[PDB]
Design a protein around this nucleic acid. Structure first.
Lengths: 206, 79, 99, 100, 151, 127
RNA sequence: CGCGAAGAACCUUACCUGGUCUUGACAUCCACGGAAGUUUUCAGAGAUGAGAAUGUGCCUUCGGGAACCGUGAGACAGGUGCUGCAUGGCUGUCGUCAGCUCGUGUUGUGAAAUGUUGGGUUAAGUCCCGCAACGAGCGCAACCCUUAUCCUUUGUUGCCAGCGGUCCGGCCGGGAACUCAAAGGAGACUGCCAGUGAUAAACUGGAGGAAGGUGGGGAUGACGUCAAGUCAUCAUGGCCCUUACGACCAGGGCUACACACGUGCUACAAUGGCGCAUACAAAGAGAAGCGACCUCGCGAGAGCAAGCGGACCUCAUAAAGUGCGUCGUAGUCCGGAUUGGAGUCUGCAACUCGACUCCAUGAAGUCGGAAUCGCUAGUAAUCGUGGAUCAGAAUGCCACGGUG
């Protein structure tokens, strides 16, 4: 069977939204198309910087991007230098005057997006896929993830037929709404087409 | 029907017809305007209207006035 | 003069923090506050086909709730107009102000 | 859709803002109005000579991302497919799954 | 149903008479959830009845009904090819239901003008027992006695 | 004195005031006979005044919004019987047994994606 | 098989005909020239080709650079081209079925087994008791939304019980009770009583309660199954085309019709048709928008023009119902297909091919062979209302209440 998206069923229960601005119907489609391009930019720039999550709010006129990332140093560059040359190409893309922030991520082993990006990276430099999965599971479980499954898919070690090996460890309860199930996803672009990588990460409940 | 504030014709047909009334009748006009109401001033002429490939000769009678040009080129073959 | 503040916002906990600021801010700077009366709540609905090609009965029905609050102020001081103008709330609240 | 077909829906917006939005909104009133002039329209014949893609009728909506003609939704400017992809990440605010 | 042994719903009694058994008759006669116009037809064709068979309006029904009420029916039942019509002694409640239902399928079949005519004449002829609703009860009591063997 | 009840059924919401003294039934400033032009709907607003006594004993002024006829009826029925238990109290025993105290929970089932109505599936074809 | 398509006149468009372009309709890079833009002009079906005017936003260690346009040659672009049997992503399906597994132990040369079976019980591998098993995980259940009772707070644009006044209108003083609105809480757990039962789990009944044994409805779809579906949403490995399979335009086509099937709507009529009066909803939408009042028109509509980003205004008179009249079992005052005439509106444009109105015309059809579908209660049946898509184009789709 097909599963509901575990982020999406849990919005306004235990997960919060990422675009958190109000509009009326004139300017709604435009805000969406701005917020798309401000994310489609900041993903392409900060690929090395290890970015979990780009929140956007819109107070007043102005746009306010928070970034969450494993590596604050490489975004802030030196004296900002890089923060401040992000702002003035963001503030074109919005139209309004901008404001970038940063947060850490303390445990990059427990973010779904970063675990997936990680695994997806290793698969493009031709690492054996069972090692790449199984490192990632161990790493989360020694830093106290209550559980974690990962699930790669489709031409693994350059086979001619697609398969999906997956590998749980601990508890991962996806029909429990109360459960914080950090989830995310990534495509590895290899010489054998794409390989897709899901990652769930239970962290406990309420 | 086009409500009674207008009837309709293309300029490139209107002016090409004013010529071959005024100058004198001739080899037929090649229009693609199928959407154009036959006026009184067009009578007698042969117009050759586009069916989708061939232009098809239409001798404009008195009785045709009011009908559209496209009504006398059929588009689809059938048996 | 009557000034009245229609607050509206997609989150119901975010809006009645922003209300409870404004009811505090007016009372402290010398005014009689009315409300904050709850108006009804536009819930939109979008059904969408869910597969990329065919399967017409596979669907996903979303909603947006828009919560709406009203706060009338009957006695303005000269402070009370500027106390609320200078205030700044969360991003997901939309204020208005009629006169 | 194609790159050509996305380029065509910039071309058709470019015109209809420049022309009809001012200049044909004159002539659609001169072709209307019964209580002023019934002979020197001239304007019906002049409305043809405007470029054909100045009409807003001629504009399709595409999904501002994938360019897909069908499945559009005006509130979001998006295909049903991309609405749902974006909904579930939390990129459309206030939007959740409903039940009643 | 297999597990699900169940109660049943209290119908309101009939507002004119207070007759719970007659409310079931307007329900049976009702079409498309128009209980209104069922009641019009029924209350009418009891006036036309009770007038023309010496009075009592509850009890001109319950004489005509008592006549069509069955007492046995068949209940077809396969043994291994040929199929055995078994007579079975019918319940108290289902007696009325079958009676009421047959009256109305008889009334709905005739060629008088209104329905309140048609009904009145297949409650006349029930009480003086001819017409199609008792020709139904007789051709059910054949089948029970013709297959009395099998019980 | 004014003894009050609310009552509801389907989308109807009746509000029902009970005065002492006499026979009379008002309902959106109309007579009971004017408002309900169906006999079935009349002898369910009166129902609770039968198990409990009235000929000429309490007036009632009532108003009702929403639903249709037999909805509004049932709301009023329930509205009365809340108001009776305000006034007397120890009539609950008899009212409970006819079961007019039970707020009737039945709404319309919503319509469901895939189906023509609440439960009406479309016509299946094997082949 | 009313499926992609939540809406093919042009557009859409991917197809055909003819007419055009070749670093290109779309993007980056370098070179050189011009501020961008504005404004009519004659050819041509149109794409396209030949003409008047105009500033100079900006800084200039003053070269021009940046905004933007054309020209130039190649790196390239482009492809709704092929493969869903190379893929990701997304979906259908068995099936909301109660199952599917693991670790450590044990039995067996071994595949494997045990657990997971047995005795009860449950909607449930649900729970108890047993037993070489002891435990764990994904599922079931719960946690979420909605509906059913009450309480607290808060009263305008919603409300009007008790007060005064009235143009009889909550309309105007006022009221904060009530409905309603939307936040916060309470409530239902086999909790209490009796009996049945291995003192177990549970079951059957009872009380009080708005609701009683998962109270009703949704969301929630285990491991997997069918090389199921989709390269034409998107992404993508490979193959392929590159003065054409790419690109622009006008006209046509996707609406064809000896036929066969699917899914619907309307019927065949007195539980009815037509005419006149008259009552009771809910849920929605609205600024290149909804559009009142009044005036014109038989009508579709038109003219004028308040209000309303909306519990305020508009769409918007719910219809079945009810009362009074009328038709009399007739292919009819049932039925509305078809065709002729005349209009209205949207739109550059209704010929191919839109919807709606008026006058006329008045087919088939008298309840449907073999067969076959849906439904267990506010359900089926029947009655209207709204929405998305949308210039216009709903008998479809999604939603709402009525009767029942």
């Amino acid at each position: 069977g097909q599963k509901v998206h575990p982020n999406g069923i849990r919005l306004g229960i235990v997960k919060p939204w990422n675009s958190t601005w109000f509009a009326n119907t004139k300017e709604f489609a435009d805000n969406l198309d701005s917020d798309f391009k401000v994310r489609q930019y900041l993903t392409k720039e900060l690929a090395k910087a290890s970015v979990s999550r780009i929140v956007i709010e819109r107070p007043a006129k102005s746009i306010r991007v928070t970034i969450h990332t494993a590596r604050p140093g490489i975004v802030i560059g030196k004296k900002g230098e890089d923060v401040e040359k992000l702002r003035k190409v963001v503030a074109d893309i919005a139209g309004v005057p901008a404001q970038i922030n940063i947060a850490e991520v303390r445990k990059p082993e427990l973010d779904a997006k970063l675990v997936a990006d990680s695994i997806t990276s290793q698969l493009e430099r031709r690492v054996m896929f069972r090692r790449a999965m199984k490192r990632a599971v161990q790493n989360a479980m020694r830093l106290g993830a209550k559980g974690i499954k990962v699930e790669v898919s489709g031409r693994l070690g350059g086979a001619e037929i697609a398969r999906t090996e997956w590998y749980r460890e601990g508890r991962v309860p996806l029909h429990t709404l109360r459960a914080d199930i950090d989830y995310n996803t990534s495509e590895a672009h290899t010489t054998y087409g794409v390989i897709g990588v899901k990652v769930w990460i239970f962290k406990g409940e309420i | 029907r086009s409500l009674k504030k207008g009837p309709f014709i293309d300029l490139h047909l209107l002016k090409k017809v004013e010529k071959a009334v005024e100058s004198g009748d001739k080899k037929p006009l090649r229009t693609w305007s199928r959407r154009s109401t036959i006026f009184p001033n067009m009578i007698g002429l042969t117009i050759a209207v586009h069916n989708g490939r061939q232009h098809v000769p239409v001798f404009v009678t008195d009785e045709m006035v009011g009908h559209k040009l496209g009504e006398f080129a059929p588009t689809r073959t059938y048996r | 003069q009557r000034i009245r503040i229609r607050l509206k916002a997609f989150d119901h906990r975010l809006i009645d923090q922003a209300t409870a600021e404004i009811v505090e801010t007016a009372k402290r700077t010398g005014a009689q506050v009315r409300g904050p009366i709850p108006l009804p709540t536009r819930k939109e609905r979008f059904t969408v086909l869910i597969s990329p090609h065919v399967n017409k009965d596979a669907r996903d029905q979303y909603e947006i709730r828009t919560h709406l609050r009203l706060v009338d102020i009957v006695e303005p001081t000269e402070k009370t107009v500027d106390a609320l103008m200078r205030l700044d709330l969360a991003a997901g609240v939309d204020v208005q102000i009629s006169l | 859709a194609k790159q050509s077909m996305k380029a065509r829906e910039v071309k058709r917006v470019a015109l209809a803002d420049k022309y009809f939005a001012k200049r044909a909104e004159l002539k659609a009133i001169i072709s209307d109005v019964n209580a002023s002039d019934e002979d020197r329209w001239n304007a019906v014949l002049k409305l043809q000579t405007l470029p054909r893609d100045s009409s807003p009728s001629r504009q399709r909506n595409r999904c501002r991302q994938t360019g897909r003609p069908h499945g559009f939704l005006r509130k979001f400017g998006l295909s049903r497919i991309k609405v749902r992809e974006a909904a579930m990440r939390g990129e459309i605010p206030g939007l959740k799954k409903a039940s009643w | 149903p297999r597990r699900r042994v169940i109660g049943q719903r209290k119908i309101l009694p009939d507002p004119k008479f207070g007759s719970e058994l007659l409310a079931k008759f307007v329900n049976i006669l009702m079409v498309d959830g128009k209980k209104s116009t069922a009641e019009s037809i029924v209350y009418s064709a009891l006036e036309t009845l009770a007038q023309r068979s010496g009075k009592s309006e509850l009890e001109a029904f319950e004489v005509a009904l008592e006549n069509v009420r069955p007492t046995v029916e068949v209940k077809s039942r396969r043994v291994g090819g040929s199929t055995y019509q078994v007579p079975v002694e019918v319940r108290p409640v289902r007696r009325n239901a079958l009676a009421m239902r047959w009256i109305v399928e008889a009334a709905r079949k005739r060629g008088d003008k209104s329905m309140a005519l048609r009904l009145a004449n297949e409650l006349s002829d029930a009480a003086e027992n001819k017409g199609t609703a008792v020709k139904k009860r007789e051709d059910v009591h054949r089948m029970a006695e013709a297959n009395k063997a099998f019980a | 004195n004014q003894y009050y009840g609310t009552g509801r059924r389907k989308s109807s919401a009746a509000r029902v005031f009970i005065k002492p003294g006499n026979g009379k039934i008002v309902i959106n400033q109309r007579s009971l006979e004017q408002y309900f032009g169906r006999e079935t709907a009349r002898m369910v607003v009166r129902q609770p005044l039968e198990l409990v006594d009235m000929v000429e004993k309490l007036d009632l002024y009532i108003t009702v919004k929403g639903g249709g006829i037999s909805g509004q009826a049932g709301a009023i029925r329930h509205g009365i019987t809340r108001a009776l238990m305000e006034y007397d109290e120890s009539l609950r025993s008899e009212l409970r047994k006819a079961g007019f105290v039970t707020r009737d929970a039945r709404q319309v089932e919503r319509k469901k994606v895939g189906l023509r109505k609440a439960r009406r599936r479309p016509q299946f074809s094997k082949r």
